[PDB]
Amino acid sequence: MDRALFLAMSGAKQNMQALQLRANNLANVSTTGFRADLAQARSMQAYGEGHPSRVFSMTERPGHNFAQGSVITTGRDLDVTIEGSGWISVLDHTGKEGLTRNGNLKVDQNGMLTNASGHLVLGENDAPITLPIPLSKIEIGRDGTISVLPQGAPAEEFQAVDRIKLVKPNDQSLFKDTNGLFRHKTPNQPYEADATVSLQTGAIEGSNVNAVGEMTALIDLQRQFEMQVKMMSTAEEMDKSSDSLLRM
């Protein structure tokens, strides 16, 4: 039949995919250090012989919202949030390094510093931070310097042991990977530490998802979705009527 049936179907299909991207945003409102995902549609025309009447649209992710997340003051010593722009460099389960903004850190039984996702926290030597096992008081600095008190030591024996690797690259050069870690679009790009990134210890950075912004985008995808499915029915209606040209 007419190709407008599939031209509208290819549009309704993308609206559902855009709806899925907004659904993931609202599910992650309470998530810690979550960067909102933007949804956009690209107009692609079928170039060739004939009148230029058919143009497809596909939904794609143009970028992410890198605005500062909501800061939650918790009073916990091992809670860190990046003041302004900046990232925390961590290595995932496989070992590939990446940037994260979740500062819900913790100390394991061996002293290795991890975050809430389990990623190991990189240090001054581009290696995971391993603090002494018998600690007494962890006091993270504003610049990322970790000053710990050995167990049984006097309060005046406060010494720095490591400095968290904070990286502030261009946000437009970062893409979210398959596990929520932002990495460079260009492969084999070294993550260079920055001396301007600051860590506000004792607070946790929340999500930056604008709940109303997603809701008002939802009510427009539904209407656009319903208009296209009416086009599918009216293209079906036209073909059924034209079935009476072979009756003879």
């Binding site: 190709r3 599939f6 179907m9 290819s10 692609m44 497809f56 596909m58």
Partner: protein, 32 residues
């Protein structure tokens, strides 16, 4: 030569939407 492919919804899509298997899309040119 023989020309073939998946009809209907999957083929009436832009190539970016990789619904069509790669080898089936090859058949849509020519074969013998």
């Amino acid at each position: 030569n023989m020309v073939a492919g998946i009809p209907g919804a999957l083929s009436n899509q832009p190539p970016a939407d990789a619904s069509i298997p790669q080898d089936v899309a090859q058949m849509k040119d020519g074969s013998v």
